[PDB]
């Protein structure tokens, strides 16, 4: 159900720079969760994530951080395929490595 | 030699000459370590295969030969898609697509383990690249 394509590791602020249908992996902070729509933010950026088909079996707390693997539906909207808690993650080191991976060949 | 921590896209770039070891940037490679999340699980006759994605642009089939280690093989199919694993194994180039025959693995449940794995791999690749450039 995930497909054999490799996910592009990016920041939420880069989602709109990618093509629809592309598999993406990113970290986001829970802003709200209603009507099958999970809104995640990172700084001033945000993205609407459809989790209707992948409803977590545990409650989601506002402001908690989640790792997401999904496909871009259109600008600002991602169809979620996998969700995992990123509790305790060192955000500064994580963003440093995401940036380095995009810059190093 | 060592345990060569690598990104999957680079594993797919190792060169073989069918006629035990492969070559990466001119360096002989056999034992490798990869880290990524499980994208899929396939069951075969006598082996379980985990497809792993480290976001490097390519995924890698990780093979667990059941009879070689029943214990580890059992732990392997106890995994679920999305779980992150650190796998140590040897490269296998029998088919056009290289695969990794697992010798050991551990599930990584600390969210910080993954970026540390990425850090280690970028540093390792940079050092090997410099060495290769100085010797060639």
Swiss-Prot record, chain A:
Of the GO CC terms on this record, one is: chromosome, telomeric repeat region
Q: What does this protein do?
A: Required for telomere maintenance.
Q: Which residues cross the membrane?
A: none
Q: Lineage from the top down? A: Eukaryota, Fungi, Dikarya, Ascomycota, Taphrinomycotina
GO molecular function (one): single-stranded telomeric DNA binding
What is this protein called in UniProt?
Answer: Protein ten1
Subcellular location(s) of the protein: Nucleus; Chromosome, Telomere
Q: Subunit comment for this entry? A: Interacts with stn1.
List, alphabetically, the Pfam families matched.
Ten1 (PF12658)
GO biological process terms, alphabetically, are:
telomere capping
Q: Which InterPro entries match?
A: NA-bd_OB-fold (IPR012340), Ten1_fungal (IPR024222)
Entry keywords, A to Z: Chromosome, Nucleus, Telomere
Q: Which species does the entry assign this protein to?
A: Schizosaccharomyces pombe (strain 972 / ATCC 24843)
Superkingdom is Eukaryota
From Swiss-Prot, chain B:
DNA-binding residues (ranges): 32-108
Q: Answer whether the UniProt record assigns the keyword Nucleus to this protein.
A: yes
Keyword Glycoprotein (UniProt): no
> From the UniProt record, which GO molecular function terms apply?
single-stranded telomeric DNA binding; telomeric DNA binding
Q: Where in the cell is it found?
A: Nucleus; Chromosome, Telomere
- The protein's role, per its UniProt record: Required for telomere maintenance.
Q: Would you kindly state one Gene Ontology biological process term found in this protein's UniProt entry?
A: telomere maintenance
Q: Provide one Gene Ontology cellular component.
A: CST complex
Going by the entry's taxonomy, the superkingdom of the source organism is recorded as Eukaryota
- The name under which this protein is listed is Protein stn1
* Quaternary structure note: Interacts with ten1.
Which key words are in the record?
Chromosome, DNA-binding, Nucleus, Telomere
